Amino acid sequence: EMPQPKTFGELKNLPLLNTDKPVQALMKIADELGEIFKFEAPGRVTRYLSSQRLIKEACDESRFDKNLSQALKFARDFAGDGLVTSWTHEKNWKKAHNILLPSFSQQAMKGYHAMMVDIAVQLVQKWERLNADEHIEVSEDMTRLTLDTIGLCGFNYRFNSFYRDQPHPFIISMVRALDEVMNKLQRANPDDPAYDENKRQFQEDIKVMNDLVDKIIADRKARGEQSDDLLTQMLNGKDPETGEPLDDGNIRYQIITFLFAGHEATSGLLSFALYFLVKNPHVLQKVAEEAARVLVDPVPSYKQVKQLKYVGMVLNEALRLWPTAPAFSLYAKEDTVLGGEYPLEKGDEVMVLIPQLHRDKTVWGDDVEEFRPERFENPSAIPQHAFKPFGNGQRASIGQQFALHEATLVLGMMLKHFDFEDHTNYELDIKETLSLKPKGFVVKAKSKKIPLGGIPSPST
Template sequence: MAEMTEMTAPSAGNDLPKGFRSAEQGWPELHRIPHPPHRLPLVGDILGASRRTPLQDSMRFARQLGPIFRRRAFDREFVFVWGAELAADMADEARFAKHVGLGVANLRPVVGDALFTAYNHEPNWQRAHDVLAPGFSREAMAAYHPMMLDVAGRLTDHWDRALVAGRAVDVPGDMTRLTLETIARTGFGHDFGSFERSRPHPFVTAMVGTLSYAQRLNTVPAPLTSLLLRRAGRRNAADIAYLNRTVDDLVRARRSASGDGNGDLLDRMLQTAHPETGERLSPENVRRQVITFLVAGHETTSGALSFALHYLSRHPDVAARARAEVDRVWGDTAVPGYEQVARLRYVRRVLDEALRLWPTAPAFAREARRDTVLAGEHPVRRGAWALVLTAMLHRDPEVWGPDAERFDPDRFDAKAVRARAPHSFKPFGTGARACIGRQFALHEATLVLGLLLRRYELRPDPDYRLRVAERLTLMPEGLRLHLERRTTAPAKADSLTEEAPSEPRCPVHGAGD
C-alpha cells in the first residue's frame, strides 16, 4: 500500500504551489544543475521523451546527467534528485516536508484532501491519520490475517483451474484481483467478486482511467488541455462519478447495518472520534479516504507482487531457497498463522529486492520548509521542491555497488542492511507522510508469496522481456507465467520457540502516510 508517486514527468498542465512559479525562483544557482542536451526553444527537453514512459525517460536522463539534474517542459523547469547523499538530506524533516507534486495534485478531483493528496496545511490529513492509525496496529493486523488467507485461497483456486486447463496465468491481472479483494474485505467488509469475473471489475477500470488521466495531464500544456484531452476529460469525469457512486453505496450499506464491520477501517471512519478534539470525519472525508485506501491499498501492492513473481520465475535458485524457507517455517501446516508470516525472512528479502528495482510508487517530492542548502552545495529557497527518483536512488552504485541492476535478495540480509547508509531504501516514501499502510502491504505480500511458492513451480515465458507500464504507479506489462504443481511434500515446521517472531521490518523511518 505504498504512497502514489508525486510526479513522474515534467508537468505543463497545472499551477505550481503558491509563491513558486519556476525553478529559477526557487533554485538560485540552477545553472550548476545539468540538463539534457539538445534543449529546444519554447518546448524544452522533449526530444526522445515518451508520454507513456515518463518515469523511465527520467531514469535514462539520470544515468546520463548524474545525481541531480533538471528538465524543462515549455516554460517550467523541474529538478530531479536521486543521489543517496542528496536524498538523505531531503529526508531531513526539520528542513524538508512532503510536497504534493503535480501528478498527485492531478488526483485531487478524485480524492481531494485525503491521506496522500492533502497539502501539509490541510487539517483533514492529521485528523484522518490519527483516527485510522490504530487500524494498522499489530492487533488489527492479526485480525486481518484470516481474511487475507481467505482471499489468497480464492487466488489459488483460480490458479489451480488455470493449471488444470494448461493456461498461463495473467500475473498483474490476478494480483490486482487479489489485492483489491483483500483491502475491500479487510477494510470495508465488501466483496467485489473479482475472481468470478472474466474482466476486471469496473472499479478497477475506473481507477486505472483516473490514474492514467492524471499522468497524461503532466504532458499537456495547460492552454491545450481542453482541446487535446477533451474526450479523455469526459471519460475521467465519468470514472470519478463511478468511483464516488461505488463508495457511497458501500458506506450507505454499512450505515444501514448499524456499523457492523467488526472494527474495520470503515467502522473507524464512521464511529471513531478524534482522540484529542472529539471530531468525527465528515461524510465527504469518509468517501475520500475510502477511495484512497481502495486505490492505494491495492494498486501498488499488486505491482510489488507482480514484480516479485517475475524475478522469482527468472531466478530458480532464489525461488528454491525461498521455497525451502517456507517449507521449513510452515511445514505441513494447512493454514499458516499470523506470526509465521513474519518468520519468512528470506521471502521478505525477495519482496524488498523487487521493490528496490521497481518501487511501484517510483518517486516522491520534497519541498524546503525554509531557505537552506542541499547537501552543502545547492542553495534552495523556501517552498522550492524537487522530485526524488526512488527507482534511481535504489540503483545508486555508491550505495548498492556496481551491480545495482542485478536482482539479489541478499542485499537485505540483516548485516547488509545495518551497513547501508540510511534513507537509501524508500519504497514507501519518507517521514511523517510515509505510507500509513506499509505494514499491511508487507504482511499481505509476504503471505501471498509464501503460499504461492509452497504450492507452485513458476515457469516464465522464455520470450518475455520485462516491460514496465506507467500510470503514476508501475506494473509489469503483459507478464504471464506457467504453473506446475509441486510434487515434494514440505518438511515439518520449525519450532516457533526457536526464534522469536518479528513484525516485517519497515524500511521507512518515521510513521504516517
C-alpha cells in the first residue's frame, strides 16, 4: 500500500503539521517517501502527490474535481462562496466565473496597465528617496504594491499604502484572519476556551473587512461611474446561461476574495524573484540588461512589458522553486484507480504538492535545485502538467496574467532604476500563511540615477 510518514497513536500523522512551516515539512516527507504518501488525522485521510506522472492523472477533470481543503473551508467564514472558496457545483461559481472572466481578458489587461504603473512608480520613488544608511524591507514593500494595485485596478480604491509606515488597517485584519485560519488547522480542541481570544479577533477582523467592502460600494454608487473595472463587472454583469447578475451578498464575498487572492501570492513572487537575483548575480545582470534594452521610455508601455521575455522566465523559475500558492486539493468524482496501483473510493481526497512536482527529476532533469531561468527558454519542451503554479483546469487562477503582468512590469522597473546588494548575506527563511513569502529579506538599492517622468532622480 501507500507509504505513510511517522505516526503518533490516536493522533496518527497530525502532529507533523503542528509546526509554523507545514508545506516545507510535507516537502521533506515527499523526499523521504516518494511520489505518493497517505496522511491521516483523526477522522480524516488525504493523499499527497509529488510526481508529474500522478499529478497528471489528478488533473484529469473527468476523474477529479476541486476540493476545498480545511483551510479553504475555514476561509469561507469571510470569503463565503466567492470564486476561491466555492465548490465547482455551487451555483455561484459558474455564475461568477462567467461574469468575471472577461475582466482578465487581453483587452481588460491593457486597461489595468496605466494604474499598475501608477503604483509601481510609487515604489521606485520610495526607494530613490531612502537615506544612505537605510535598507529595503522587500516583502513589506512588495505587499504595499500588490494590494494598492488590486485595490486601484479592480475597485478604483486607493489604500495608499506608500503614505503609511504601518500596513493599512484593512490589510492588518486580513493577514491576522489568514493567520487565524492557518492556526485553526493546528487546533485539536477548537472548542477549548483558550482560543476564545482568537475567536474574538477573528470576528472583529472580519467586521473590518466587511466595513471597507461596504465603503467601497459607497464610493461606487456615489462615484457616478467614471470607472470601468472589475467592480463595474460585478455589479452589472448578467450570467449568460442564467441571465441574472450576482446578488449583493456574493458581490461582498468576491470583493474580499479578490483583495486577498490578488496581492499575497504575487507579493511572494516579487520577493522570491528579487531574492534569487541577488543570490545569482549573473542572472541579475542579464535581467538588468533586458530592462535597459526594452524599457526605453520614461514609463513602461503595455507592449514593452510583454517584450520582457527574460523577466518572464525569471518569474516562472521563481514560481518553479517556490510557488506562492503551494498546494491545491482534489477529490475523485467517481471510483477510480490512480497510477494503476492506488484505488480511490469516490469522494477521496488528494493534495498536489506543487513544490515537489516542480522538483520531479524525471521531467525537469537533475538540475532541479539550481535557479536557472533558461529552462523556460523553449516553453513547448516542458511536459503538460509539470508546471502548475496557477492550479488546474476551470479552477485555475483567474488572476494569472494580471499577476504576471504586474510582477513583470514592476521587476523590470526595479532593475532599470537600481542595482541591488545582499548586504546581510541573507539566509532564506520562508514564512507560510496559505502562501510562501521570504521572511526578513532585506537589501540595499543603489540608484542608477535614471529619471521617472521628465523629473530627475535624487541626483539633486
